[PDB]
């Protein structure tokens, strides 16, 4: 192939985890101008990719889009003259016809376990039935079918990981986030980012399959009282959380307002510690070798979203003993003291 789309869905987190798949694609065929037809807040991840070409905004899960917009995007994908679709939108006919109207050589999608996925095999060269119908709930990997078929042993090795989630920031986002925490009282090497705050905001970057993923504030007040201050910067998803956090944990506690995942990875890259819950920030911390802890609401969910905690040897995983995101708040402080210094 030379031109390849991606009709990925979900938001920040699902499109973030697709970066080893894109690196797999460019590792498979030498020069590919990969495109992305994602939802909003999916484009914002694609500063961190150094591989791709357009990265539009479409919201593929709309299911009754604007017919002007729908016809325009069908014709746009026709005018870009692709060779491979790689949907992972998890839909069948109706959307298989959408991938079929693109003049594509290799129509690839995901397919429901249910019925809304019949008649799709007619219009797809790969079927790739998935699980749970809530595809982010499958965990970190989510694409082992698509990873194992893209690059089957036909001439050489698959090479299905290449040190998965190598995100990369540029100098411009580094300078603007440097100004954003330099407005706070942080030093460019010695601070700790969080990105876990109980909120009602779509900049939380969580998942589609996780519900109770974001930790509270008075629980967080206990966590931030139990921990020594290594300048913990606080990453709010919206400005209405600023005064709320300053009411709970204090006025001296620095708050950095970040809603962009590229800005969030730039804030990771200057940090020295990460106390993220199950958001994009765990994977961004595992990118560029930052020591994370990775809070979760379940040990099993933590294994599904981090299967590589034994590999990086810094992301010492902590979850809740029950479900419902209520952990011990003690031993996590202990190994936060252990690994961050």
């Amino acid at each position: 192939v030379r031109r390849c789309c991606c009709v990925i869905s979900g938001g920040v987190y699902e499109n973030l985890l697709f970066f080893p798949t894109i690196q797999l694609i460019k590792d498979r065929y030498p020069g590919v101008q990969v495109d992305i037809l994602t939802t909003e807040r999916g484009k914002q991840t694609y500063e961190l990719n150094k591989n791709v070409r357009w990265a539009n905004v479409y919201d593929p899960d709309d299911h009754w889009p604007e017919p002007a917009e729908y016809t325009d995007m069908i014709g746009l994908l026709k005018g870009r003259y692709y060779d491979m679709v790689l949907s992972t939108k998890l839909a069948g006919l109706g959307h298989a016809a959408f991938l079929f109207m693109t003049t594509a050589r290799d129509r690839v999608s995901y397919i429901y376990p249910n019925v809304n996925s019949a008649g799709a095999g007619l219009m797809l060269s790969e079927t790739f039935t998935a699980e749970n119908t809530n595809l982010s709930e499958l965990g970190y990997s989510m694409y082992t079918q698509m990873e194992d078929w893209l690059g089957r042993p036909f001439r050489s090795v698959p090479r299905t990981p290449l040190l998965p989630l190598r995100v990369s920031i540029s100098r411009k986002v580094k300078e603007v986030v440097a100004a954003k925490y330099r407005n706070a009282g942080a030093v460019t090497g010695k601070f700790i980012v969080i990105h876990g705050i109980e909120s009602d905001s779509k900049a939380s970057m969580q998942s589609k399959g996780d519900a109770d993923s974001l930790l509270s504030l008075e629980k967080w007040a206990k966590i931030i009282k139990g921990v020594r201050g290594f300048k913990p910067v606080f990453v709010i998803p919206h400005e209405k959380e600023r005064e709320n956090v300053e009411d709970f944990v204090g006025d001296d506690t620095s708050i950095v307002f970040i809603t962009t995942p590229g800005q969030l990875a730039a804030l990771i890259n200057d940090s020295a510690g990460v106390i993220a819950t199950n958001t994009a920030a765990i994977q961004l911390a595992n990118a560029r070798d930052k020591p994370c802890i990775g809070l979760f609401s379940s040990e099993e969910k933590g294994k599904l979203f981090v299967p590589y905690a034994e590999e990086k040897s810094n992301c010492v995983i902590i979850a809740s003993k029950t479900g419902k995101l209520a952990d011990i708040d003690i031993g996590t402080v202990k190994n936060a003291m252990q690994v961050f210094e």
């Binding site: 299911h63 009754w64 839909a91 069948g92 006919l93 109706g94 429901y112 249910n114 019925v115 809304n116 019949a118 008649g119 119908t133």
Partner: protein, 206 residues
């Protein structure tokens, strides 16, 4: 929740997670659970047939009373002799086709995986009959648009369905009795009520 008359607790054998529950079972018919499942599928099919019926009656009578088309009265509509086909053939054809439909629906209700697995040839379409649910078959044949791809988390859509359908069934009983003691169409009875409402009701029939 609001269960069909305040001052009464809903029965404990039905509550919440069902299409428009509201807890109305004073005569203990949904007490047995499999009986309730059978009655749910019965209700859905009854309500959908009744909705098609109310549409096919109200639309035809809007065309008739106003005078757009010379269609017959719903009451005297069955004895229309069609040129290309006869009613004696149509009953048999309906029997065949709706048997292939309803027996398939049944064998899905008793065995959801059926009609799509093995030797279930319907012109090679053994995939659109996946079912996905009791009473909500889905698939490219049955929901081409797929407004509710999901069906467990589609409580608004199923609630709209069942409420409109309960109301259509009640309106069909209206069509049955209202036009057996008045011998006119529904729209005729309506405009009879909307001229002098306090002088043309059921009990104003002497």
């Amino acid at each position: 929740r609001a269960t069909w008359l305040p001052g009464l607790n809903p029965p404990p054998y039905l509550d919440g997670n069902l299409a428009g529950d509201y807890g109305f079972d004073p005569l203990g018919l949904g007490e047995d659970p499999e009986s309730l499942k059978w009655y749910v599928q019965a209700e859905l099919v009854h309500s959908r047939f009744a909705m098609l019926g109310v549409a096919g009656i109200l639309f035809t009578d809007l065309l008739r009373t106003t005078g757009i088309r010379n269609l017959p009265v719903w009451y005297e509509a069955g004895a229309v002799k069609f040129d290309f086909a006869s009613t004696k053939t149509l009953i048999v054809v309906q029997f065949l086709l709706m048997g292939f439909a309803e027996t398939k629906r049944y064998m899905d209700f008793v065995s959801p995986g059926s009609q799509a697995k093995e030797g279930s040839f319907f012109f090679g379409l053994e995939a659109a009959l996946e079912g996905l649910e009791p009473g909500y078959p889905g698939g490219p044949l049955l929901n081409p648009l797929g407004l509710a791809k999901d069906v467990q988390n589609a409580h608004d859509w199923k609630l709209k369905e069942i409420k409109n359908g309960r109301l259509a069934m009640m309106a069909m009983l209206g069509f049955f009795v209202q036009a057996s003691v008045t011998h006119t169409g529904p729209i005729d009875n309506l405009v009879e009520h909307l001229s002098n409402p306090w002088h043309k009701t059921i009990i104003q029939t002497l």
